Amino acid sequence: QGKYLNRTINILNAGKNIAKSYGHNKLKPIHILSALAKSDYGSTLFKENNVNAANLKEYIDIALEQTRAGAPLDNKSKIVNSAEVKETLALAEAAANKYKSPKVDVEHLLSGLSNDELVNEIFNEVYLTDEAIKAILKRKFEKTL
């Protein structure tokens, strides 16, 4: 039970581990994107939209390194959501409710992540536009019907 699907929560928790690896004690949208791109569901999603997996991971890793906050933190140190991520989740929740989904899934998280300027630069470079995202969301709803 819960408003977030398991797979969504798993992406968020993998994101925290990526954040610590880049020396961050605050989870950031780029960290969540790294996690989403590598997850089972996220990787399949990008494939179908025809987003080259190698090229996307390469953009993500460049951005992860540019924004590195330190050497890896002990994987028993404390990590909290940044204000940026609290927004990611608020927008994911809003998008899910708009498309009449009772749970927040990976596509909704994807829509939320597109608010972040760093993540959105990346999306625009792999030709995943705002219009494309909406279409992903619209198709997902329609498979419900």
Its domain, for residue 26, covers 1-145
Helix ranges restricted to H, the chain: 6-21, 29-38, 40-48, 53-66, 83-98, 106-113, 117-125, 130-143
Place of tokens 């991971």: 57
**What determination technique applies here?**
X-ray
The answer to whether the CB of 71 falls within 8 A of the CB of 23 is yes
What CATH number did the domain enclosing 62 receive?
A: 1.10.1780.10
Task: Tell me how many domains the chain contains.
Answer: 1
Q: At 23, phi and psi to the nearest 5? A: 70, 20
Question: Would you state the torsion angle of the CA atoms of residues 76, 66, 64, 27, taken in this order, to the nearest 10 degrees?
Answer: 50
Of 89, 64, 87, which is closest to residue 4 (Cα–Cα)?
A: 89
Spatial separation of the C-alpha atoms in residues 96 and 118, rounded to whole Å: 23
The answer to whether the CB of 117 falls within 8 A of the CB of 63 is no
Full 3-state SS string of 46-84: HHHCCCCHHHHHHHHHHHHHHCCCCCCCCCCCCCEECHH
Task: Give CA 70 to chain center in angstroms.
Answer: 22
